[PDB]
Design a protein around this ligand. Structure first.
Ligand SMILES: CC(C)(CO)[C@@H](O)C(=O)[O-]
Ligand SMILES: CC(C)(CO)[C@@H](O)C(=O)[O-]
Ligand SMILES: [Cl-]
Lengths: 284, 285
């Protein structure tokens, strides 16, 4: 069937009710548009896990702590829909912010996930993760999916949503999808477009340094402090300006303990105009 | 044929089965120690769906006073026996360790800031965050078509309505009028906290509220004077009033020329019990 494109809440409601009454398993892929091949692998994964796949395109003002950053977020609906139809999305839901938050942002009911919202990336971004957990909860309530796909690329987001889902009683399988990489290993991001030609040839070093760190851990290394210092050194020597680096429990993002079963390595570093990031799971 | 379920996986099994059977589901959230008011919620729910799910959970997240949580009555077998006669289809009665397996310090929460910090929310800081969090969780677990709440907790109902509108829940929210003892006292599990002597004083709250409502029926509109008098009368008979309010029944804001219906919102301590009541007042003439 032709892909449906819905902008209003009443028309969305009609359709979701129909699918729920028909017994269709529903997958949800939340996005903010400006889609690339990474997003398309989310849709591909969703397709294997459900009867119908809903993809949202919504630049969420509640998660932008600088309100002007909304003004500058790329809007490319036609291009996004071209891609989505080709990957078999059944419904694209692309609402106006006025329809999602008609009572404004300050007095909008919100969902907050303690600790995961305020550590690491949340520490310098008060209110960002509240906006994420709120919109995702709302979309879950609107669309009633059995499965929802998120990129591992945005790892703290993924961990946050997993916690929310466990805590709030959602019967939803949260699927983390690995990042698409270039043949040279560079993780796919809209950010990559901001690199110069010379910078694009340095960029693959972030994953290589990460994977060197992960290999040491696979054998048994656990002096987290030293591992990270090394990696910041190497980032500098090959032309990045490192940001802070971390190795944390994959579920809580807290420092590893003897009960932690999985770690996540969290890399971030500047290359000219772009702050690039990557991550890697380590079985402990 | 009423079912009792305690665990979250068993609840989901049953909710899935009913949806496969094409059933519409009504939800009635409670904290147990059920009375006739609760039975009237169940009766109303049965007229609005095929199956009625009643929850019984003393929710620690909404008790801002540890002594109040400690003393809240627990009478599950009695509760269940009453519900079987009113034809509830399922009682869901979870343990706190399953609802909040790691406790409350890191538990994800839902806040409705439009209503959580004013009026009763000002008198009970932290309380409404507990309510919206558990009700959201129950909605997510059950996915009812309709959910029924008592108008005795008037601001709670407004708060849940706001949460549903804000959060995109496809759930019809129904309010059911307060059921009272023959002597006028609003039924409440909290009434059990009263001594025998206090129980004979307790009807005065309704009487004072109704006397205020009568003055407003006659055209009185000086709210602070009306409330000062009600507070004086409560003190006289042995209550300690908490903050009293008269607001627009729809918005809970101060009355304006456009208001058509007021709500009197009463709260008062009698011994160890903190009792509430309310009354709608038609302002039209
Ligand atoms: C999950 C998401 C759609 C929520 O707005 C957004 O944070 C995103 O695309 O990363
Ligand atoms: C709605 C309710 C069950 C939520 O815990 C509770 O506040 C109550 O019964 O008043
Ligand atoms: Cl309470």
């Amino acid at each position: 069937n032709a892909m449906l494109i819905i902008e209003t809440l009443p028309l969305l409601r009609q359709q979701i009710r129909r699918w729920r009454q028909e017994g269709k398993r529903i997958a949800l892929v939340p996005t903010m548009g400006n889609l690339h091949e990474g997003h398309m692998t989310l849709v591909d994964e969703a397709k294997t896990r459900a009867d119908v796949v809903v993809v949202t395109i919504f630049v969420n003002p509640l998660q932008f702590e600088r309100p002007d950053d909304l003004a500058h977020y790329p809007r490319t609906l036609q291009e996004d829909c071209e891609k989505l139809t080709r990957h078999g999305a059944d419904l694209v839901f692309a609402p106006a912010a006025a329809d999602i938050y008609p009572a404004g942002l300050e007095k909008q009911t919100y969902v907050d996930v303690p600790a995961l919202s305020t550590i690491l990336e949340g520490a310098s971004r008060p209110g960002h993760f509240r906006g994420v957990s709120t919109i995702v909860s709302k979309l879950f309530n609107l669309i009633q999916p059995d499965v929802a796909c998120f990129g591992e690329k945005d790892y703290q987001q993924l961990a946050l949503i997993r916690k929310m889902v466990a805590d709030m009683g959602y019967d939803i399988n949260i699927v983390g999808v690995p990042t698409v990489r270039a043949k040279d290993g560079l993780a796919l991001s809209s950010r990559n477009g901001y690199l110069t030609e010379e910078e694009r040839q340095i960029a693959p070093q972030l994953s290589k340094i990460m994977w060197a760190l992960a290999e040491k851990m696979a054998l048994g290394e656990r002096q987290i402090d030293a591992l990270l210092e090394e990696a910041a050194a190497q980032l500098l020597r090959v032309g990045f300006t490192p940001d802070e680096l971390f190795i944390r429990d994959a579920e809580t993002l807290q420092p590893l303990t003897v009960d932690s079963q999985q770690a996540v390595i969290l890399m971030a570093a500047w290359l000219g105009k772009a702050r690039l990031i990557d991550n890697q799971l380590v079985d402990l």
